[PDB]
Design a protein around this ligand. Structure first.
Ligand SMILES: O=C(CO)[C@@H](O)[C@H](O)[C@H](O)COP(=O)(O)O
Ligand SMILES: O=C(CO)[C@@H](O)[C@H](O)[C@H](O)COP(=O)(O)O
Ligand SMILES: O=C(CO)[C@@H](O)[C@H](O)[C@H](O)COP(=O)(O)O
Ligand SMILES: O=C(CO)[C@H](O)[C@H](O)[C@H](O)COP(=O)(O)O
Ligand SMILES: O=C(CO)[C@H](O)[C@H](O)[C@H](O)COP(=O)(O)O
Ligand SMILES: O=C(CO)[C@H](O)[C@H](O)[C@H](O)COP(=O)(O)O
Ligand SMILES: O=C(CO)[C@H](O)[C@H](O)[C@H](O)COP(=O)(O)O
Ligand SMILES: O=C(CO)[C@H](O)[C@H](O)[C@H](O)COP(=O)(O)O
Ligand SMILES: O=C(CO)[C@H](O)[C@H](O)[C@H](O)COP(=O)(O)O
Ligand SMILES: O=C(CO)[C@H](O)[C@H](O)[C@H](O)COP(=O)(O)O
Ligand SMILES: O=C(CO)[C@H](O)[C@H](O)[C@H](O)COP(=O)(O)O
Ligand SMILES: O=C(CO)[C@H](O)[C@H](O)[C@H](O)COP(=O)(O)O
Lengths: 266, 266, 266, 266, 266, 266
């Protein structure tokens, strides 16, 4: 695994955005061979979406031949609701770039048949072949997507019951009232994520320090699903300073030595 | 993983039996497409075999098109011995249901060529395709089938030397004399079990509390092979009250919330 | 996993050599079906190379139809340098046995295109099909080959930055001057090793006691990559006495009972 | 120790307030033999202070012969600043009860000789003999008073540097401006607390879940100073529901049956 | 501490009995200066009591000037009930030796003022000065005496509520009827034990393997009160083979070489 | 405790030497009130002893009124043997300073009554009252003095059997011949050390990284006796860079900001 030890959220966003751009440009996507990008919501990717939109407007990237898939979506939350993941993605990213509406893939949290909806999302990924880069964040409790504690490490897209801890954390977006946070969500599985060619996790704040420790220095287990990355051949964690506080000095020293040139570019 | 927190062994048996019945009936097995059931011995499945036989006699299930495979068998123990797994299964299940003798698969602990016997058991599973539901229990030391501490997590059917701890526990069936308990057994591997479509483990008593903790809150490791379930896409653990004593309050709370409707049916 | 608890390095070498000979002879390699052997360097395999050369000269083994692959090699170290792994292997093994030069495979640490070199080494393994037996050792920090702490458990052959701890340990071969130890090395991946049919690790000295504990009694994790063996269907660890000091009494007792006949042959 | 498992912060303050009043009335303090009460600040004791005030108003307790000592005080913060502990205590407690000004002992965070201040505080306690009851809270990092991680378990009153985490936690009272929270604070030591006849710690909120687990199920260490309570002859922890989430099922079960009739008072 | 690694419970009782007799004879007790012996009940000390009796019969020891204090006694159980500790001690020890009735101190589990009973017991010990040797056993959950998990490490003699596990364990003596085992018991505290000049704990059986590991290799904590022995100046643990199974190899090796000539007596 | 994070062993000896001189000068010892210094041997204090010598030479300190006590001494090793602690201390320290022979207290490793020797040493310390400063090092296994793992935390000066690991470590001074290193040694106990007014431990090298982690972030236990420092009112650990590699990032950060201006002296 690669861990990029940066200082601030602004730097994290800039490194991630730049990595996404270079992968796409190096890929040279065509209409017959698009680049498939998996994306997350939440507060963590804000600086990355910001940087991505800038680079696009500056003419550095084109999303014309990029197909996107999101990690999850709230169940039973009106699609028009500003806090639905559909609204989040359009407001913060889609409405600003040249990506065709047919290239966008989002789960329908209001689908009448939940099993069918999840299964079809898997079929859609399969029709493209693979997700080339899946970007995400991590929960306080260590979840990747919404694969809460005790989620199978070989899981597929399906519905999951959100942990009280996750709902309290997400209530910050629902006027700080947990009763307004949806109780369920459709989410890609750990197995789904393990199938992506590259996984890039963004980690910000001391609130994520225990999750980062579990991922990097902990053992593989289903309580902290972020530990599944130890089993992925190409995972990267991009971190700010506060989030690395629980790591051993030797561990952080190793990554600093490794990524010195790859980050110190002002 | 799913964990069903029940109170007594009677409830555990009833939930498990009911789950087996609904899977079979939903499957609609034919002579050209049978339902393959993996089964265990020991004290744990007693209430489940009892409930299964009842439901059969009440006309709720038919084992006519069900093929069964057992987890293991003692090596060097006469097949006629009442404590052999062959005798256990006939006395407690086979002799009471409408399953054809040709649909029953048991390992021969007295086979002259042990490697050949184990290999052929694997071939037989393969000829059917897959085990749809493999039911089992857990050892005090955390073993699944007889995959004792330090058993490969990718293991196949083979012979294994029983741990002194396992023999002392099993001596309860041999007049409380460990010297009468067989030292070896042929057992399906962890990889064999991981290949089943669904795995259902029954957990009863405080004697199993540490094993349950390891499975649910511990990391993946070969010392407590029951932890392999964290890697299975469809595992369920059915527990009574005493067995959950080593779990964290938050963990048990999560499962109770999840399975409330799925268990509270009187 | 199998653990062979021996007393001295001389016994370890003799058991390992004998195991390699019996595998080859049982295989009956031909020019159209060679035996593929993966090999390590370092101080650990010294007694095994010694015993192998003896058995060859005594007419017990022939390496005529054996193809070999080494685990790694230093990057930027002149091939002629006595401490390069190319020199180590020729001096200690190749120059003494009847193995054809075309059957030898070593990584080129001075290759102009590192990615290409690593990729081609993988292709070469693939053209043979599989490595039948991969022999190795373990690092103080728990590494297998040079898959240092935080290496993916599904990794392939690639370049890796050596840990300060590994360089200090290896400086014993460079006049005890860490500044002379290369900083990088091309190494087979954990996934590469997991693909071998059988893996045999040699463990010598109390300096390796924590690594052995992690492998046998620890959980699967990428910090101690030797733990990947818990996931291999056919792994063996051959140990001397000092290296088992960190194991539990019950664990060592189990293996002693198991391997009693398999080792007590004077 | 005794752990009182309650549901709400309202029940916690009421249970703690009733306990203090019961101790005081049983002691029957007088001018020559006052009851010595140790007290804390922060958000946790609010409901306790309100309840004590209601009880004093109803005529149930008098503080005429109660001498108090506070745990700590910020260094360099002006005395009349609303966030100084001096201000907090008068506003939330002293202003509403009949306690004589001479009976109130607070640390002078702005004294010329900080070292003389600490020595004199310890002297003051000794002049009275012993603190009969010391009430306190617990930090997210497990500190008792401001004895931050790595504080001697035999420490006395002295100056202490606040951990970055505590300042972030306390910033709530400084307009979430960490820069405004004082970096230093005079505090009573762990030995000072262990010298008290009885220690009662109030635990509220999920954020204290790990600190509660460290105090109850962890080992004694100087990283989580709250663990010192395992060494005290008479320690009580009064908790609400969310703070108990990281404890084992059997732990909370034990305490629930012990305190059943002891908390039924509503 | 000293750990005496023996094989059998017969050797354990003989080693412990010889130790007591040696201490007593060396002390040379008299009416004005008696030897004070602290004693336990339960299944563990049986072989010790038998051996002590054989030694007294052979003329090797006299209890004429030995004062005894027992660790605990069940609350509410009638005195002449065969399972009361009073009954156990007379039947298994007092009835066969020359100890004066006035030298025997037992806890009155059926006293009117339970609190007065405990205070007076502590007073009795103080009147003699100090207990010279306190013998005890260890519970499966690590309790010393009946100082159940979460008992203060500075505790004194008091009333205590038995853990569900201890009652299950003790049900062996109550026809395996847990409902018959007393729920409460008066017991000496951890501080009471730490005040003794020397403490000797007998450990027998695999069931105590984890308690032994907690006492020897664990950290001091109030969950496994047996860990208090790390703080005692003169603590001895006498063990049989199965109780040592959870210790590390190097731990048991150290103790074996230290006590070699000290246990060769047969 | 205080942890002084320095880079080099040269800075460590200089910081420790300046600390001793400052304590001595502030104390202003005299014939009737000498300063009592506890001292160690081994490789760690070399730079400290050199620095103290340079300071005495420059006229900064006098040892005319300093009484010293050493931690331990090998049993059975001839006094004038260059590796005896008596020889080490005179050669490395006493020969170069103005300390009177009568002020020097060393353990007599070759005394007729070893037990009388230990009792008299403790008596000697008591006659002076208290050791004001005890300097020591830490073993790889965490021992303080020669209080090997499983040593009472309340122990006094006594004879002790060296662990195999310590003898291997100390063989460096005996031509790497473990057989030449004395198996026994008289040593001060943990209680003896805890009775000192201040304890300063010097930590140098990666080999002590785990011992440092056990002392700072671990729990108090008798396996790593260095952990006793968590219980001491005034303990200081002076470390070089490599010994800090196993600590968490936040731990070392806390200490760095606390001691910033306290180590800038060069
Ligand atoms: O010294 C004190 C209080 O005088 C602290 O230990 C607090 O008790 C603890 O930091 C909790 O703070 P709150 O969460 O209650 O605000
Ligand atoms: O208070 C006592 C004994 O008076 C207990 O700590 C027992 O020593 C322990 O429960 C062992 O019981 P047995 O296993 O020996 O019966
Ligand atoms: O009793 C002593 C010293 O008198 C020991 O605890 C050493 O301080 C420790 O073994 C370190 O040894 P070195 O690594 O410094 O040689
Ligand atoms: O699937 C989701 C996001 O759609 C994730 O697991 C979040 O990345 C994680 O919960 C963090 O959320 P933030 O802290 O970024 O808000
Ligand atoms: O839809 C999900 C089913 O997969 C459920 O409500 C179950 O609780 C599930 O079995 C647990 O999750 P995983 O093991 O699938 O993560
Ligand atoms: O393979 C076997 C059973 O054939 C198992 O691992 C048992 O389920 C386990 O050993 C528990 O046994 P009981 O406690 O149910 O008897
Ligand atoms: O037949 C089994 C062989 O697999 C053996 O006696 C070995 O001891 C085995 O190698 C260990 O078990 P696994 O790693 O296969 O579980
Ligand atoms: O890849 C390598 C060797 O080419 C290994 O991981 C070594 O086996 C290990 O580093 C031990 O080295 P020695 O202790 O045997 O020297
Ligand atoms: O060539 C290796 C790349 O694989 C690198 O320098 C990276 O640091 C790597 O991503 C880490 O290692 P693995 O996770 O691949 O072990
Ligand atoms: O005034 C306190 C000193 O007692 C200091 O700033 C030190 O940092 C102290 O040595 C650490 O704290 P304790 O070990 O005393 O908790
Ligand atoms: O009589 C005992 C009281 O000392 C009680 O029932 C309490 O439960 C006690 O506070 C807990 O035990 P210790 O902390 O005193 O062990
Ligand atoms: O002279 C010492 C005795 O105090 C001994 O050889 C013992 O082994 C001792 O009981 C253990 O050491 P401590 O528990 O006293 O450290």
């Amino acid at each position: 695994m690669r861990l990029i030890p940066l200082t601030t959220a602004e730097q994290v966003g800039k490194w991630a955005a730049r990595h996404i751009v270079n992968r796409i440009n190096a890929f040279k996507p065509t209409a017959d061979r698009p680049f498939v990008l998996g994306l997350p919501t939440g507060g963590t990717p804000m600086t990355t979406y910001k940087a991505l939109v800038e680079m696009h407007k500056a003419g550095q990237v084109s999303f014309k031949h990029v197909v996107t898939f999101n990690m999850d979506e709230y169940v039973g939350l009106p699609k028009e609701h500003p806090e639905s993941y559909y609204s989040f993605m359009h407001r913060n990213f889609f409405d600003h770039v040249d990506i065709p509406a047919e290239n966008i893939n989002l789960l329908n949290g209001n689908a009448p048949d939940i099993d069918a909806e999840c299964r079809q999302y898997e079929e859609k990924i399969r029709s493209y072949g693979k997700i080339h880069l899946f970007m995400g964040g991590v929960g306080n409790d260590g979840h990747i997507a919404f694969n809460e504690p005790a989620s199978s490490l070989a899981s597929r897209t399906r519905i999951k019951t959100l942990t009280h801890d996750t709902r309290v954390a997400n209530s910050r977006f629902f006027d700080n009232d947990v009763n307004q946070v949806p109780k369920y969500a459709l989410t890609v599985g750990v197995g789904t994520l393990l199938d992506a060619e590259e996984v890039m996790i963004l980690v910000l704040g001391s609130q994520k320090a225990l999750a980062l420790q579990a991922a990097v220095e902990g053992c593989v287990n289903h309580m902290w699903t972020i530990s599944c990355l130890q089993l992925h051949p190409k995972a990267i964690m991009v971190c700010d300073e506060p989030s690395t506080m629980e790591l051993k000095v030797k561990t952080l020293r190793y990554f600093n030595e490794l990524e010195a040139e790859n980050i110190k570019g002002l």
